[PDB]
Amino acid sequence: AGVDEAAIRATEQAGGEWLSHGRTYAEQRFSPLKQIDASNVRSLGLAWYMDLDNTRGLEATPLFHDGVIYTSMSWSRVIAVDAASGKELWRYDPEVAKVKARTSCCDAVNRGVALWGDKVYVGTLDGRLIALDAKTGKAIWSQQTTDPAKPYSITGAPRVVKGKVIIGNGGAEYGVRGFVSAYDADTGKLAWRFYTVPGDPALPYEHPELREAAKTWQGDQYWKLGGGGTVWDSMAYDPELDLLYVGTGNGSPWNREVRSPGGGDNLYLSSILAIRPDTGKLAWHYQVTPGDSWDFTATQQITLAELNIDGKPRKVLMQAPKNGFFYVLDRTNGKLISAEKFGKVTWAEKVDLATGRPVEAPGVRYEKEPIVMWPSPFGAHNWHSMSFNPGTGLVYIPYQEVPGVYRNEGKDFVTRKAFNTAAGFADATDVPAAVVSGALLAWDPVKQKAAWKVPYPTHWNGGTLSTAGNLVFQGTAAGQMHAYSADKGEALWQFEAQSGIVAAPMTFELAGRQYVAIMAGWGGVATLTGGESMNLPGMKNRSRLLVFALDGKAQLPPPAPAPAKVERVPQPVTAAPEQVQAGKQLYGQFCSVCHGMGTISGGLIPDLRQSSDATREHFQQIVLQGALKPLGMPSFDDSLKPEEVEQIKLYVMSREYEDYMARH
Ligand code: HEC
Ligand SMILES: O=C(O)c1cc(C(=O)O)c2c(n1)C(=O)C(=O)c1cc(C(=O)O)[nH]c1-2
Ligand SMILES: [Ca+2]
């Protein structure tokens, strides 16, 4: 009763609505709407906005259908907003335990919901796939898709194909076995499940593909460690070819030397899968990063399009994953058409067209010595949306340039109840502004070359939106909403959003008027690992749903200045070097993922260097006795001893004094 395949396909020509995550099943995030164009976007203004009781990352792409905006907020909460009145119609809160974040790698985020019939679908941080009544927001059915005992979580938006709700999950950083499932839209009954990596050999393979994949894995530890290959984000669908395309993630642990000692491609890690939606049977696959040992996922946006290659019309599938190569594949059979670097890439010389395999540079697998390379775990392109404009033939990518540093923990690797990369990710003590940069990259998929590029001081800028009005919209880490000419990248309109933006803009039509909406709420994993680059002006969270339209007259109020804060004058901290070092390591292994690398917090979670004296006195109570558990600060008594927590406190105070002396 409402949203069905015909309705979603129809939006391909009708720009009024946005019924699926990437707008259309092809996920081009291109709107035919052109009331707002390059000639008049200078007149664009804020039409209205909604303040949100949210203080964490907002990554959702809103959906618009029949006058209603459907979106989500941090902690997997869903809200329906009437686009005409601007009033919240209803909200659904799954009530995820705040401490669930201990096993949620990258901020308490949610990329959006899906629509089908008269229901709304959302995935939660604790592994649930829930169906809600579109009109009232009441829960219809709920499925616990993951083992509550394992470090799984759902952050991505589901898609609905032929009456089946498709959703994956995340957790490869902690160590889990990846998979994507299809649930019946009306009942929630599991239709089929495709695991992306093989499981315990002592048990049967769930499907034939796994038997073949198993031949590409070595050793007897990968299934105990999880294996990885989580499907936490992108997927596309072509109804004519009847193929569901899914992107799989990195391995668990990251380091193949520990994950699969003897080597191997480790299928289907970092791969693009073409699956039969009705059965879950694999039609074809393409492995983006064989033997992935760098957190190089292939879960980034998968866009379907029709391009003319060498004078011949081709049905392609495009992706610009973390590894830095831009892929153009024949979406009917998975044959590689082209693959070229779209930014700084030093881990591989190129992707061999004939074999389809990347030609790795010397020492990039860091077996004997640590390696500094590009891209990094943050990726040349992460989840921030890209978009395709059929008119210009260009793909607009939120490019990122950050150095990746990997160390082989090898025999010294120890599985912990925390991140298990086995690649020395814990060694990081900062993300310097000097070593990072970003850019709005207009990529030509046919020529495999940049058409134009707009530079940004840092990475972690928001997704893009393309429209028929020769425009591309994007929000930035620095706190602005932008509009550039699609063809040349000329800056046409800017707006101070009052919050760093990471989500993707979307547009729709209501009563003959075009609106552009964006979920403004600084967040995502980078804001948690922090570092200097993530503490520049504008990188603050002020969660709001912002809606723009021609001649919009709304104005955001000026924030109130922060109260007085007399920083404590740090007394010298004398301690044995090894003791401070022990604290440095323990902190990096267990606390950096939320409080920031080297204690340099990103602002969403407290800076341990600035804790009050009362807080410092209760350090043991907080860390080991869960005194702040109701606020989301986990208790680590299951992993750390009092003396170890003391070593961490010593390290923290050492950094506070170290930094305080920096100034003055
Ligand atoms: C994310 C899952 C976290 C990890 C891992 C660690 N901490 Fe944490 N911590 C987290 C939150 C969300 C908060 C804020 C709670 C609130 O609403 O105030 C905290 C807070 C603390 C504090 C108090 C800070 C202050 O108010 O000055 C301390 C002392 C603290 N956390 C310590 C700590 C240590 C030592 C950790 C590693 C073992 C650690 N945290 C991990 C979230 C998360
Ligand atoms: O390995 C995984 O399972 C997994 C899951 C997720 C997630 O669910 O958000 C992210 C990542 N990996 C990841 O590698 C990454 O860089 C990342 C960034 C973000 C974010 O929300 O900003 N999520 C994730
Ligand atoms: Ca990952």
XYZ file of C-alpha atoms and ligand atoms in Angstrom:
732
model
C 0.000 0.000 0.000
C 2.356 2.707 -1.225
C 6.030 2.261 -2.062
C 6.763 -0.618 -4.458
C 9.219 -1.377 -7.274
C 7.221 0.540 -9.889
C 7.112 3.597 -7.622
C 10.854 3.586 -6.954
C 11.709 3.076 -10.635
C 9.372 5.897 -11.659
C 11.425 8.396 -9.632
C 14.144 7.872 -12.226
C 12.323 10.419 -14.398
C 10.120 12.156 -11.812
C 12.220 14.222 -9.414
C 9.549 15.059 -6.858
C 10.350 12.221 -4.470
C 13.348 10.357 -3.019
C 12.247 6.842 -2.034
C 15.497 4.940 -1.475
C 18.855 5.665 0.192
C 20.773 6.624 -2.967
C 17.546 8.057 -4.377
C 17.157 5.538 -7.214
C 18.012 1.822 -7.201
C 21.031 2.753 -9.337
C 22.171 4.952 -6.441
C 23.269 7.883 -8.611
C 21.891 10.403 -6.100
C 20.899 12.549 -9.076
C 17.664 14.537 -8.984
C 15.897 15.533 -12.232
C 14.546 18.546 -10.330
C 15.807 21.826 -11.739
C 13.823 24.688 -10.197
C 17.086 25.529 -8.444
C 19.896 25.813 -10.990
C 23.324 27.362 -11.507
C 21.682 30.581 -12.683
C 19.637 31.197 -9.528
C 21.202 29.168 -6.714
C 22.755 32.405 -5.469
C 19.235 33.185 -4.216
C 19.053 29.954 -2.223
C 18.305 30.461 1.454
C 17.354 28.551 4.587
C 13.613 27.827 4.371
C 13.193 26.160 7.743
C 15.016 23.971 10.216
C 14.480 21.556 13.073
C 16.659 21.403 16.162
C 17.338 17.804 17.146
C 17.970 16.353 20.611
C 21.154 14.812 19.247
C 24.832 15.289 20.117
C 26.484 12.565 18.051
C 27.038 12.014 14.339
C 24.119 12.494 11.948
C 24.802 10.405 8.826
C 21.290 9.897 7.485
C 20.110 10.640 3.968
C 16.484 11.704 4.410
C 13.795 10.081 2.273
C 10.776 12.006 0.997
C 7.409 10.514 0.120
C 3.913 11.978 -0.090
C 4.758 15.178 1.793
C 6.694 13.416 4.552
C 10.399 13.416 5.368
C 11.690 10.174 6.919
C 15.090 10.330 8.589
C 17.139 9.064 11.531
C 19.346 10.408 14.319
C 22.143 9.109 16.531
C 21.464 5.884 18.452
C 19.288 4.573 15.610
C 16.279 6.786 16.357
C 13.751 7.434 13.597
C 11.531 10.478 13.042
C 8.943 11.458 10.454
C 8.667 15.170 9.665
C 5.784 16.856 7.837
C 7.467 18.841 5.046
C 4.623 21.359 4.834
C 4.337 22.253 8.529
C 7.879 21.332 9.544
C 6.445 19.512 12.559
C 7.637 16.145 13.852
C 4.847 13.654 13.118
C 6.281 10.868 15.258
C 9.540 9.377 16.446
C 10.693 5.866 17.202
C 13.445 5.181 19.718
C 14.689 1.558 19.856
C 16.373 2.486 23.132
C 19.840 1.158 22.325
C 21.970 0.735 25.440
C 24.478 3.596 25.365
C 27.323 1.243 26.309
C 26.614 -0.646 23.074
C 29.022 1.918 21.624
C 31.875 -0.086 23.158
C 31.233 -2.558 20.326
C 30.278 0.015 17.667
C 33.493 1.173 15.974
C 32.491 4.393 14.445
C 30.151 6.618 16.486
C 26.475 5.933 17.291
C 25.400 6.627 13.716
C 22.642 5.623 11.305
C 22.652 6.380 7.576
C 18.902 6.342 7.072
C 15.756 4.286 6.644
C 14.023 2.551 3.738
C 10.419 2.593 2.522
C 8.146 -0.155 1.203
C 4.376 -0.470 1.228
C 3.160 1.610 4.154
C 6.169 0.885 6.360
C 9.553 2.347 7.288
C 12.620 0.160 7.899
C 15.663 0.826 10.070
C 18.698 -1.081 11.337
C 19.971 -0.528 14.875
C 23.323 -0.327 16.628
C 22.448 -3.460 18.589
C 21.698 -5.571 15.523
C 17.953 -5.223 15.033
C 16.081 -4.700 11.755
C 12.781 -3.040 12.607
C 9.691 -2.308 10.521
C 7.597 0.699 11.521
C 4.179 1.939 10.431
C 4.824 4.950 8.180
C 1.790 6.898 9.382
C 2.134 6.434 13.157
C 5.658 5.170 13.770
C 4.467 2.100 15.674
C 6.669 -1.006 15.442
C 5.214 -3.792 13.292
C 8.020 -6.357 13.468
C 11.562 -6.666 14.750
C 14.349 -9.113 13.982
C 17.562 -9.587 15.937
C 19.748 -10.118 12.869
C 22.961 -10.597 14.843
C 24.159 -12.616 17.841
C 23.826 -10.160 20.771
C 26.905 -11.805 22.282
C 29.098 -10.822 19.328
C 30.423 -7.282 18.559
C 28.001 -6.632 15.679
C 26.042 -3.449 14.945
C 24.044 -1.919 12.097
C 24.779 1.617 10.901
C 23.804 1.493 7.255
C 20.501 2.157 5.566
C 18.547 -0.836 4.361
C 17.235 -1.100 0.800
C 14.083 -2.951 -0.223
C 14.206 -5.106 -3.330
C 11.252 -7.109 -4.627
C 9.572 -7.156 -1.221
C 12.749 -8.154 0.620
C 14.511 -5.801 3.029
C 18.278 -6.067 2.532
C 20.611 -5.218 5.405
C 24.116 -6.095 6.514
C 26.048 -5.022 9.603
C 29.417 -3.872 10.908
C 32.005 -4.961 13.454
C 35.066 -6.113 11.506
C 37.291 -3.941 13.714
C 36.360 -6.022 16.772
C 36.262 -9.239 14.779
C 33.077 -10.663 13.263
C 31.946 -12.781 10.317
C 30.372 -10.699 7.568
C 27.050 -11.368 5.879
C 24.092 -9.739 4.155
C 20.502 -10.912 4.594
C 17.105 -10.470 2.964
C 14.036 -10.284 5.217
C 10.372 -10.341 4.136
C 9.091 -6.745 4.156
C 5.682 -7.737 5.525
C 6.649 -10.254 8.207
C 10.368 -9.907 8.833
C 10.896 -13.607 8.122
C 14.437 -14.345 6.919
C 14.351 -15.194 3.196
C 18.060 -15.857 2.675
C 21.509 -14.994 3.989
C 24.810 -14.745 2.151
C 27.898 -14.932 4.342
C 30.829 -13.077 2.793
C 33.519 -15.199 4.447
C 33.737 -18.937 5.316
C 33.017 -20.154 8.842
C 34.242 -23.035 11.028
C 35.264 -26.019 8.839
C 33.692 -28.318 11.452
C 30.267 -27.085 10.371
C 28.660 -27.241 6.896
C 29.037 -24.355 4.463
C 25.792 -22.348 4.427
C 25.979 -22.093 0.622
C 28.266 -23.493 -2.160
C 30.111 -20.210 -2.761
C 31.695 -20.506 0.684
C 33.280 -23.856 -0.158
C 35.072 -22.195 -3.053
C 35.993 -19.139 -1.001
C 37.506 -21.346 1.712
C 40.202 -22.387 -0.766
C 41.531 -18.824 -0.585
C 42.080 -18.827 3.185
C 44.979 -20.318 5.160
C 45.367 -21.504 8.744
C 42.926 -22.418 11.503
C 42.340 -19.018 13.108
C 40.305 -16.943 10.667
C 36.911 -18.283 11.742
C 37.761 -17.792 15.415
C 38.782 -14.193 14.752
C 35.692 -13.618 12.616
C 37.238 -13.197 9.184
C 35.571 -9.878 8.454
C 33.935 -8.841 5.195
C 31.060 -6.959 6.813
C 28.444 -5.409 4.516
C 27.897 -2.193 6.473
C 26.912 0.355 3.851
C 26.380 0.374 0.085
C 24.394 -1.817 -2.298
C 22.556 -1.253 -5.584
C 19.915 -2.970 -7.699
C 19.125 -3.420 -11.389
C 15.587 -4.795 -11.926
C 16.224 -5.482 -15.623
C 19.235 -7.716 -14.948
C 17.625 -8.871 -11.698
C 20.853 -8.364 -9.782
C 21.462 -7.062 -6.275
C 24.944 -5.559 -5.960
C 26.579 -5.569 -2.532
C 29.880 -4.260 -1.221
C 31.842 -6.202 1.395
C 34.320 -4.916 3.955
C 37.782 -5.424 5.414
C 39.100 -8.521 7.140
C 39.134 -9.376 10.842
C 41.816 -8.785 11.945
C 43.021 -6.226 9.386
C 46.478 -7.827 9.147
C 46.401 -10.920 6.919
C 49.643 -12.165 8.495
C 47.572 -12.914 11.590
C 44.169 -13.473 9.958
C 45.414 -15.871 7.255
C 49.144 -16.496 7.963
C 49.715 -18.576 4.836
C 48.320 -15.858 2.582
C 45.462 -16.066 0.105
C 42.919 -13.767 -1.529
C 40.514 -14.437 1.349
C 37.262 -14.219 -0.665
C 34.964 -12.474 -0.390
C 36.721 -9.706 1.544
C 36.700 -6.250 -0.073
C 34.550 -7.414 -2.995
C 31.591 -6.295 -5.078
C 29.001 -9.065 -5.232
C 26.216 -9.490 -7.788
C 23.502 -11.546 -6.097
C 20.173 -12.991 -7.241
C 17.654 -11.111 -5.031
C 15.148 -13.977 -5.109
C 17.546 -16.683 -3.950
C 20.740 -15.193 -2.554
C 22.763 -17.030 -5.200
C 25.946 -15.320 -6.391
C 25.936 -14.398 -10.105
C 29.418 -12.862 -10.184
C 31.962 -11.142 -7.962
C 34.944 -8.835 -8.308
C 37.489 -8.622 -5.523
C 38.546 -5.022 -5.063
C 41.374 -5.746 -2.602
C 42.654 -9.350 -2.650
C 44.101 -10.351 0.722
C 43.094 -6.973 2.182
C 45.454 -6.140 5.039
C 44.778 -2.394 5.365
C 41.132 -1.930 6.466
C 40.408 -1.421 2.754
C 36.671 -1.977 2.462
C 34.656 -2.205 -0.754
C 31.477 -1.073 1.013
C 31.668 2.392 -0.532
C 28.942 3.664 -2.858
C 28.076 1.428 -5.792
C 26.562 3.387 -8.671
C 24.951 1.927 -11.781
C 24.990 3.868 -15.045
C 25.116 3.675 -18.831
C 28.315 4.985 -20.385
C 29.817 4.980 -23.866
C 33.178 3.215 -23.704
C 35.323 3.049 -26.842
C 32.285 3.991 -28.898
C 30.119 1.248 -27.392
C 27.191 1.691 -24.958
C 27.992 -0.171 -21.732
C 25.911 -1.069 -18.675
C 28.372 -0.273 -15.913
C 28.771 -0.343 -12.155
C 31.105 2.218 -10.615
C 32.781 2.430 -7.214
C 35.515 4.532 -5.623
C 36.407 2.461 -2.521
C 38.922 3.142 0.247
C 41.943 1.783 -1.653
C 42.029 4.768 -3.996
C 41.171 3.191 -7.344
C 38.077 4.163 -9.317
C 36.416 1.073 -10.729
C 34.231 0.739 -13.798
C 32.881 -2.775 -14.247
C 30.444 -4.308 -16.709
C 27.505 -4.818 -14.343
C 26.051 -7.694 -16.373
C 29.012 -10.044 -15.869
C 31.480 -8.342 -13.543
C 34.239 -7.897 -16.130
C 36.635 -5.070 -15.279
C 36.458 -2.258 -17.829
C 38.906 0.114 -16.138
C 40.527 0.967 -12.811
C 42.696 4.034 -12.213
C 43.872 5.999 -9.173
C 41.635 8.923 -8.202
C 44.079 10.269 -5.635
C 47.373 9.518 -3.894
C 47.911 5.740 -3.962
C 51.235 4.137 -3.050
C 50.277 0.667 -1.800
C 49.830 -0.473 -5.396
C 51.400 0.513 -8.721
C 48.160 -0.086 -10.621
C 45.417 -2.645 -11.155
C 46.381 -5.043 -13.943
C 43.581 -4.875 -16.514
C 44.141 -8.444 -17.713
C 44.203 -10.137 -14.297
C 42.005 -7.545 -12.617
C 44.368 -7.807 -9.669
C 46.240 -4.874 -8.098
C 50.019 -4.896 -8.543
C 51.278 -4.402 -5.004
C 54.297 -2.206 -4.278
C 57.264 -3.577 -2.287
C 56.736 -4.042 1.453
C 53.132 -2.810 1.567
C 52.107 -5.912 3.534
C 54.470 -4.749 6.273
C 55.630 -8.248 7.223
C 59.140 -7.241 8.319
C 58.931 -3.459 8.729
C 56.068 -1.001 9.347
C 54.791 0.799 6.258
C 53.644 4.366 5.676
C 51.349 4.445 2.651
C 48.233 5.911 1.026
C 45.326 5.516 1.367
C 44.737 4.798 5.063
C 41.989 3.139 7.145
C 40.041 6.389 6.741
C 40.092 5.711 3.004
C 40.626 7.847 -0.090
C 36.818 7.743 -0.063
C 34.753 6.472 2.864
C 30.965 6.290 3.414
C 30.414 9.978 2.569
C 28.211 9.811 -0.526
C 29.283 10.457 -4.087
C 26.859 11.287 -6.896
C 26.598 10.895 -10.663
C 25.268 13.491 -13.081
C 24.182 11.868 -16.385
C 24.275 15.319 -17.960
C 27.946 16.038 -17.278
C 28.891 12.372 -17.101
C 30.923 13.090 -13.971
C 31.045 11.472 -10.522
C 31.499 13.836 -7.574
C 33.595 12.254 -4.837
C 34.370 13.422 -1.279
C 38.085 12.667 -1.719
C 40.352 12.207 1.289
C 44.142 12.204 1.581
C 45.456 10.762 4.861
C 48.612 8.704 5.568
C 48.161 5.076 6.600
C 50.643 3.517 9.037
C 50.627 -0.251 9.586
C 52.753 -2.470 11.841
C 52.733 -6.277 11.940
C 51.846 -7.240 15.519
C 52.368 -10.794 14.264
C 53.222 -13.360 16.933
C 52.717 -10.688 19.573
C 49.069 -10.240 18.553
C 46.570 -10.770 21.342
C 42.802 -10.731 20.915
C 41.212 -8.204 23.258
C 37.725 -6.967 24.052
C 38.436 -3.888 21.963
C 39.677 -3.203 18.429
C 41.576 -6.209 17.047
C 43.436 -4.897 13.990
C 46.730 -6.731 14.575
C 48.143 -3.844 12.513
C 49.277 -1.477 15.264
C 46.378 0.939 14.797
C 46.766 1.705 18.517
C 50.191 3.261 17.847
C 48.604 6.430 16.435
C 48.906 9.466 18.703
C 47.555 12.158 16.368
C 46.176 13.015 12.930
C 48.134 16.240 12.134
C 46.496 18.930 10.027
C 49.727 19.089 8.015
C 49.393 15.504 6.750
C 45.724 15.552 5.750
C 43.584 17.163 3.070
C 40.336 16.602 1.221
C 38.659 17.715 -1.983
C 35.434 17.706 -3.935
C 36.586 15.610 -6.870
C 34.684 15.668 -10.171
C 35.727 12.377 -11.761
C 35.264 11.400 -15.409
C 34.610 7.612 -15.401
C 35.139 7.216 -19.154
C 38.442 9.090 -19.333
C 39.393 7.980 -15.801
C 40.658 11.486 -15.127
C 39.658 14.457 -12.972
C 37.444 17.049 -14.699
C 37.859 19.506 -11.820
C 38.789 19.516 -8.138
C 37.926 21.825 -5.234
C 40.400 21.579 -2.329
C 39.512 21.461 1.364
C 41.948 21.842 4.302
C 41.001 18.429 5.691
C 39.238 15.175 4.954
C 35.903 14.075 6.447
C 33.634 16.378 4.441
C 30.061 15.321 3.618
C 28.448 13.478 0.738
C 27.422 15.033 -2.563
C 24.143 15.557 -4.403
C 23.764 16.092 -8.158
C 20.781 17.719 -9.911
C 19.603 18.538 -13.445
C 20.175 22.219 -12.733
C 23.925 21.911 -13.357
C 24.588 21.761 -9.621
C 26.381 19.639 -7.060
C 25.692 20.210 -3.350
C 27.997 19.274 -0.468
C 28.448 20.032 3.224
C 31.920 20.384 4.761
C 33.881 19.497 7.888
C 34.550 23.227 8.300
C 30.832 23.859 8.728
C 29.446 25.064 5.389
C 26.834 23.951 2.881
C 27.993 24.483 -0.706
C 26.638 24.564 -4.235
C 28.996 24.399 -7.226
C 28.410 24.335 -10.976
C 28.313 20.674 -12.000
C 30.314 21.237 -15.174
C 33.175 23.430 -13.933
C 33.117 23.390 -10.134
C 32.563 27.130 -9.760
C 31.552 28.138 -6.213
C 27.980 29.437 -6.477
C 26.450 29.463 -2.991
C 27.681 29.078 0.600
C 25.906 28.908 3.962
C 27.226 28.710 7.534
C 25.493 25.600 8.911
C 26.783 25.874 12.522
C 27.849 22.234 12.469
C 30.375 20.123 10.630
C 28.539 18.103 7.981
C 29.198 14.468 7.041
C 25.793 13.288 5.779
C 24.634 13.681 2.173
C 22.214 16.314 0.867
C 18.969 15.290 -0.816
C 16.271 17.210 -2.665
C 12.538 16.869 -3.278
C 9.514 18.804 -4.501
C 6.517 19.828 -2.389
C 3.568 21.799 -3.757
C 5.582 22.800 -6.831
C 8.532 24.025 -4.767
C 12.005 22.459 -4.669
C 13.742 21.969 -1.323
C 17.265 20.782 -0.510
C 17.653 19.122 2.892
C 20.715 18.088 4.870
C 21.155 16.374 8.234
C 23.763 18.574 9.910
C 25.529 16.806 12.770
C 29.319 16.468 12.985
C 30.355 12.899 13.741
C 31.609 9.606 12.379
C 34.698 7.618 13.347
C 37.193 10.380 12.477
C 35.625 12.767 15.010
C 36.217 10.116 17.688
C 39.820 9.194 16.881
C 40.272 12.960 16.805
C 43.705 14.475 16.424
C 44.689 18.034 15.511
C 43.055 17.936 12.069
C 39.684 17.164 13.629
C 39.854 20.138 15.995
C 39.887 22.994 13.488
C 37.240 25.767 13.536
C 33.738 24.652 12.599
C 34.273 20.999 13.511
C 31.553 20.999 16.147
C 28.245 19.179 16.502
C 25.052 21.251 16.510
C 22.524 18.699 15.268
C 19.857 20.061 12.957
C 17.796 19.138 9.922
C 18.336 22.085 7.563
C 16.005 22.702 4.623
C 16.781 25.236 1.897
C 14.711 26.732 -0.927
C 14.891 29.731 -3.253
C 14.517 32.979 -1.315
C 14.451 31.123 1.992
C 14.346 33.633 4.838
C 15.031 31.541 7.953
C 18.050 32.345 10.126
C 19.935 30.196 12.616
C 20.379 31.894 15.999
C 23.874 32.772 17.259
C 25.127 30.165 19.747
C 25.831 31.316 23.306
C 29.543 31.593 24.202
C 30.938 28.759 26.316
C 30.981 29.481 30.079
C 34.173 30.331 31.963
C 36.796 27.580 32.068
C 39.913 28.156 34.170
C 42.156 25.349 32.938
C 44.016 23.579 35.732
C 47.727 24.335 36.071
C 49.295 20.822 35.756
C 51.810 19.837 38.423
C 54.842 17.990 36.995
C 54.213 14.270 36.517
C 57.216 12.155 37.505
C 57.048 8.480 36.555
C 59.110 5.612 35.181
C 59.292 5.829 31.363
C 58.042 2.250 31.009
C 55.067 3.065 33.249
C 54.038 6.022 31.094
C 54.672 3.889 28.007
C 52.495 1.118 29.434
C 49.729 3.669 29.904
C 50.257 5.024 26.400
C 49.710 1.559 24.922
C 46.782 0.547 27.119
C 45.112 3.873 26.323
C 45.641 3.414 22.594
C 44.277 -0.130 22.727
C 41.170 0.553 24.847
C 40.365 4.274 25.015
C 41.564 6.126 21.915
C 38.614 4.976 19.791
C 36.311 7.236 21.815
C 38.519 9.716 23.694
C 40.902 10.361 20.800
C 44.314 9.234 19.587
C 46.988 10.511 21.979
C 44.100 11.775 24.143
C 43.406 14.488 21.551
C 39.600 14.266 21.706
C 37.381 15.271 18.797
C 34.784 17.036 20.930
C 31.919 14.515 20.912
C 33.290 12.710 23.964
C 35.225 14.311 26.896
C 38.915 15.203 26.655
C 40.561 13.210 29.446
C 43.259 15.885 29.609
C 40.642 18.355 30.836
C 38.865 16.169 33.409
C 38.054 17.894 36.701
C 39.863 16.985 39.915
C 36.758 15.217 41.226
C 36.663 13.120 38.049
C 40.359 12.225 38.389
C 39.697 11.124 41.982
C 37.007 8.756 40.699
C 39.044 7.483 37.740
C 39.015 3.895 39.047
C 35.291 4.040 39.847
C 34.462 5.319 36.362
C 36.734 3.007 34.371
C 36.391 -0.216 36.396
C 33.215 0.239 38.433
C 31.045 1.705 35.678
C 30.114 4.868 37.570
C 29.273 6.624 34.277
C 27.769 3.566 32.594
C 24.296 5.131 32.228
C 25.920 7.920 30.200
C 27.624 5.457 27.869
C 31.072 5.271 29.466
C 31.667 1.488 29.668
C 33.243 -0.356 32.575
C 36.439 -2.183 31.594
C 36.752 -4.493 34.588
C 36.532 -7.395 32.133
C 39.802 -6.329 30.499
C 41.822 -4.054 32.778
C 43.307 -4.317 36.271
C 43.411 -1.387 38.724
C 47.174 -0.993 38.232
C 46.654 -0.859 34.456
C 44.001 1.850 34.754
C 46.445 3.770 36.943
C 49.064 3.497 34.200
C 46.512 4.972 31.787
C 45.737 7.835 34.178
C 49.466 8.464 34.460
C 49.708 8.625 30.662
C 46.716 10.964 30.411
C 48.125 13.353 33.021
C 51.484 13.152 31.258
C 49.849 14.384 28.051
C 47.957 17.139 29.871
C 51.187 18.474 31.365
C 53.053 17.875 28.105
C 50.481 19.946 26.194
C 50.009 22.577 28.889
C 53.735 23.293 28.785
C 53.456 23.509 24.994
C 51.662 26.811 25.488
C 53.139 29.301 27.964
C 33.428 4.676 23.782
C 32.683 3.330 23.658
C 34.345 4.845 24.997
C 35.461 4.181 25.297
C 36.153 3.021 24.523
C 35.979 4.774 26.529
N 35.160 5.791 26.957
Fe 35.437 6.965 28.567
N 33.778 7.949 28.134
C 32.904 7.722 27.062
C 31.804 8.665 27.105
C 30.647 8.717 26.080
C 31.998 9.472 28.177
C 31.098 10.650 28.610
C 29.930 10.298 29.560
C 29.147 11.560 29.863
O 27.997 11.691 29.423
O 29.746 12.417 30.543
C 33.224 9.027 28.817
C 33.790 9.596 29.947
C 34.959 9.215 30.573
C 35.558 9.843 31.749
C 34.966 11.066 32.470
C 35.460 12.302 31.669
C 35.173 13.688 32.216
O 33.940 13.955 32.405
O 36.123 14.456 32.404
C 36.689 9.180 32.032
C 37.688 9.453 33.171
C 36.843 8.128 31.043
N 35.763 8.180 30.168
C 37.873 7.230 30.948
C 38.034 6.254 30.005
C 39.160 5.342 29.944
C 40.346 5.334 30.922
C 38.949 4.539 28.872
C 39.820 3.404 28.335
C 39.888 2.169 29.256
C 37.711 4.933 28.263
N 37.153 5.984 28.956
C 37.144 4.372 27.135
C 33.100 6.749 26.110
C 34.138 5.849 26.030
O 34.737 -2.969 9.389
C 33.473 -2.720 9.620
O 32.579 -3.533 9.918
C 33.095 -1.267 9.530
C 31.857 -0.776 9.931
C 31.593 0.646 9.959
C 30.187 1.099 10.408
O 29.330 0.208 10.591
O 29.960 2.305 10.519
C 32.693 1.533 9.548
C 33.921 0.873 9.133
N 34.102 -0.457 9.127
C 35.184 1.582 8.646
O 36.199 0.946 8.293
C 35.179 3.168 8.593
O 36.164 3.733 8.217
C 33.893 3.791 9.056
C 33.591 5.151 9.161
C 32.299 5.232 9.648
C 31.498 6.491 9.961
O 30.324 6.313 10.330
O 32.062 7.589 9.797
N 31.833 3.944 9.818
C 32.768 3.063 9.481
Ca 36.427 -1.248 9.023
